[PDB]
What we know:
Blueprint: H1 2-6, H2 9-21, H3 25-36, H4 43-55, H5 58-63
Helix pairs in contact: 2-3
Amino acid sequence: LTANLGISSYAAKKVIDIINTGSAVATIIALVTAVVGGGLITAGIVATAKSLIKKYGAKYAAAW
């Protein structure tokens, strides 16, 4: 997340919590956008990020 979005690790970890907690993609997008203050985390980012945390893990996606 940090690498692709160009955000801090703080924000990335925050995104992680949201993508981890939220279920519906649209629901997550709205929450992440509210937290990071940018429309950077789109459906594509959400879908990818949750899939990365599934395989590689939360900490992986944080770096991604």
